[PDB]
Amino acid sequence: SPRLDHTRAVNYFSKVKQLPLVKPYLRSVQNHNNKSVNESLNNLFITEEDYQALRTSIDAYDNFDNISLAQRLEKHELIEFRRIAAYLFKGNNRWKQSVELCKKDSLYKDAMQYASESKDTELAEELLQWFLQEEKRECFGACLFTCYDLLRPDVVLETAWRHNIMDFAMPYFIQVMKEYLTKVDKLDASESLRKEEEQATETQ
Amino acid sequence: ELLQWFLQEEKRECFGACLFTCYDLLRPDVVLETAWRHNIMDFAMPYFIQVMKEYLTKVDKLDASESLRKEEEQATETQ
Amino acid sequence: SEQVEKNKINNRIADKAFYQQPDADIIXXXXXXXXXXXXXXXXXXXXXXXXXXXXXXXXXX
């Protein structure tokens, strides 16, 4: 352990077709954050089908090629990695994961949750505009959008009309913002009166 | 309590869900919606919902007014 | 053998739609649960009757 360079080892294993013996050799190790470790280590958890470890195998040590790695995963059939390659590519960057969907990997599930944390607001119109032409859970769509402050303005609430006379009734949220914009109004009128009132004592 | 009951047992819900509202506001968003999920049809009536509208558009009048009060005096004493 | 075997098992416990997906969700909060609560939604939205509407409005606040 102590007083090896590791960098000059995994190399002799890889071009050996026998590197996995070192599987556990990578156990107590991998604290070194070394590349050859994660790098093939992932390659290992990939062809081996390991996700628990692989996920945790990177739930801390971030030393690797955050790219091609998810390239071999997407080429899979077993979504486990087509699900994480989805994550791996997104990684603390939500824009990738969504802007890369289509029919497949369009899960009526996580797709309604990975948008929320976003910041590129308008992408809501992107997603939503799409919900309309290709899906029907637009309800949960045009809604989970709204409730988070407001990133779904008038602009989007209408974009949907130009089209759907029928289809729109749902609201949970539109009112959440209503008395919200009726409560901030409460405290505001309150401080207005604050002012009024004081300007009444020192100078009635 | 009363309203929820009006629905399952009576129909003058109109006078119900209304005389409720006009006094300040005791009929918040919470109720104005309960009727959407629930009764699609049955809800159109309003006399009151708007009483609170320009009410929350008039208190807004005087408020914008005092906002400008501030603006005006500030810019003045400091131009 | 076993891994490729473990492989097919998914796409098998009520066909990668709320089986393997649920497994992944197990391996927002809920919160997120309340969201996936708006949730269920079959025959006709299968939700807003009781729990669904309830949690929904509640959180929405």
From Swiss-Prot, chain B:
The C-terminal third of the heavy chains forms the hub of the triskelion. This region contains the trimerization domain and the light-chain binding domain involved in the assembly of the clathrin lattice. The N-terminal seven-bladed beta-propeller is formed by WD40-like repeats, and projects inward from the polyhedral outer clathrin coat. It constitutes a major protein-protein interaction node. Residues 1-79 are annotated as: Trimerization. This is Clathrin heavy chain 1. Clathrin is the major protein of the polyhedral coat of coated pits and vesicles. Two different adapter protein complexes link the clathrin lattice either to the plasma membrane or to the trans-Golgi network. Acts as a component of the TACC3/ch-TOG/clathrin complex proposed to contribute to stabilization of kinetochore fibers of the mitotic spindle by acting as inter-microtubule bridge. The TACC3/ch-TOG/clathrin complex is required for the maintenance of kinetochore fiber tension. Plays a role in early autophagosome formation. Clathrin triskelions, composed of 3 heavy chains and 3 light chains, are the basic subunits of the clathrin coat. In the presence of light chains, hub assembly is influenced by both the pH and the concentration of calcium. Interacts with HIP1. Interacts with DENND1A, DENND1B and DENND1C. Interacts with OCRL. Interacts with ERBB2. Interacts with FKBP6. Interacts with CKAP5 and TACC3 forming the TACC3/ch-TOG/clathrin complex located at spindle inter-microtubules bridges; the complex implicates clathrin triskelions; TACC3 and CLTC are proposed to form a composite microtubule interaction surface. Belongs to the clathrin heavy chain family. It comes from Bos taurus (Bovine). The gene is CLTC. It is found in: Cytoplasmic vesicle membrane; Membrane, Coated pit; Melanosome; Cytoplasm, Cytoskeleton, Spindle.
From Swiss-Prot, chain C:
It comes from the Eukaryota. Coiled coil: none annotated. It is found in: Cytoplasmic vesicle membrane; Membrane, Coated pit. Clathrin coats are formed from molecules containing 3 heavy chains and 3 light chains. Interacts (via N-terminus) with HIP1. Interacts with HIP1R. Belongs to the clathrin light chain family. Clathrin is the major protein of the polyhedral coat of coated pits and vesicles. This is Clathrin light chain B. It comes from Bos taurus. The lineage of its organism: Eukaryota, Metazoa, Chordata, Craniata, Vertebrata. The chain holds residues 143 to 169 of 228 of the full protein.
